[model samples]
Target chain A: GIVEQCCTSICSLYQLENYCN
Target chain B: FVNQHLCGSHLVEALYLVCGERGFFYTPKT
Candidate 1:
């Protein structure tokens, strides 16, 4: 699940940053 | 290998320039 974790972290850090602000 | 490169485009591409709104800039990578 490392890839999934990485993807999740990446999205949480980058995509979520854009989505929230 | 290319597909695994999550930062090959989009996010990386967007970050590769200056965002004058915040007075920020980033240099290109290899």
Candidate 2:
């Protein structure tokens, strides 16, 4: 599996706050 | 990999930067 937190951080950076779900 | 998830950063190489740094979508090669 990929680094999960990395994905979460991306959503946060782009302001796509709804993406982490 | 992430889908048509539009994202932005400074010519960032890290795909996650699109979502966040170190992300897979950082490169935007798709």
Candidate 3:
């Protein structure tokens, strides 16, 4: 599940404009 | 466990940033 973990972590870090909020 | 697809709130962008650094072809949404 490295992709899932890494994706989640990265998503949390960057958090785009208003997506992962 | 769930699979992480390339989508959402720059999540793909984040992956593109991190993975791209290591030479992974992670495409970010535009």
Candidate 4:
């Protein structure tokens, strides 16, 4: 089985870090 | 199967930064 990350909190951070730069 | 109970999940992404030539510049879009 593959485990999926919980994106609730980290979603915003991911976008901010990746897209904002 | 074993029980780790529940630790937690932390996801990380890797990023690399590079500079371009003097005459070349990158663009950003939303």
Candidate 3 C-alpha lDDT tens digits along A1-21:
334545555434333323321
Candidate 1 vs candidate 2, DockQ winner: 1
Q: Model 1, residue B18: displacement in angstroms? A: 12
**lDDT at B5, model 1:** 26
Pairs in clash, predicted candidate 3? none
lDDT of 1 by residue, A1-21 (tens): 223333444433343234221
The reply for model 4, stretches above 4 Å from the true place, is: A1-11, A19-21, B1-30
Cα-based lDDT at residue A11, candidate 1: 35
- Cα lDDT tens digits for candidate 4, B1-30: 121221122222211121112122223235
Chain B alone: TM-score in each candidate? Answer: 0.27, 0.16, 0.34, 0.16
DockQ of each: 0.10, 0.08, 0.06, 0.09
DockQ of predicted model 4: 0.09
> Weakest 10 consecutive residues, lDDT, candidate 1 chain B?
B1-10
Question: Model 4, residue A14: what's the lDDT?
Answer: 36
Residue pairs with backbone overlap in model 4: none
Residue-level lDDT for B20 in candidate 2: 58
| Candidates by lDDT, descending order | 3, 2, 1, 4
Any runs in candidate 2 off by more than 4 Å, and if so which?
A10-21, B1-30
Q: Is the docking of candidate 4 incorrect, acceptable, medium or high quality?
A: incorrect
Error of 4 at B25 (Å): 13
